[PDB]
């Protein structure tokens, strides 16, 4: 049986696949509430999360384990579902990314 590190797999396989997805671009940096005109965002969302922050955490030895990283991805998706209206384009984009994420995480070593 091959021994492959879970956090390494999360960086090189999982994050890489999601980052390249056509719907990844609104999730590659923190939400810019000022430019997007969402003045209530940082009041409703208490733990903001994005793939750019996850990428930095994976590169800067932040995570204790793979589950702490998985929680950051889940926070990013649920923040989107909490803030935005169902049926909004951004929600449809997050749902497609979350479906791909769950597929990739099923094959985690």
**Contacting positions for ligand 8NG (CB under 6 A):** 26-29, 31-32, 36, 80, 83-84, 89-90
**Which one, 32 or 107, has the nearer CB to ligand 8NG?**
32
Quick one: how many helices (H) and strands (E) in the chain? Answer: 7, 0
Q: Which of 66, 93 has the CB closer to ligand 8NG? A: 93
The C-alpha atoms of residue 29 and residue 67 are separated, in whole angstroms, by 21
CA–CA distance, 30 with 71 (Å, rounded to integer) = 16
Residue 7 vs 90, nearer CB to ligand 8NG? 90
């Amino acid at each position: 049986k091959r021994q492959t590190n879970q956090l390494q797999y999360l960086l090189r396989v999982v994050l890489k696949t999601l980052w390249k997805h056509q719907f990844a671009w609104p999730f590659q940096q923190p939400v810019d509430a000022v430019k997007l005109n969402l003045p209530d965002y940082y009041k409703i969302i208490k733990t903001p999360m994005d793939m750019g922050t996850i990428k930095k955490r994976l590169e800067n030895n932040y995570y204790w384990n793979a589950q702490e990283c998985i929680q950051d991805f889940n926070t990013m998706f649920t923040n989107c579902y909490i803030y935005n209206k169902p049926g909004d384009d951004i929600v449809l984009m997050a749902e497609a990314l979350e479906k791909l994420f769950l597929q990739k995480i099923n094959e985690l070593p």
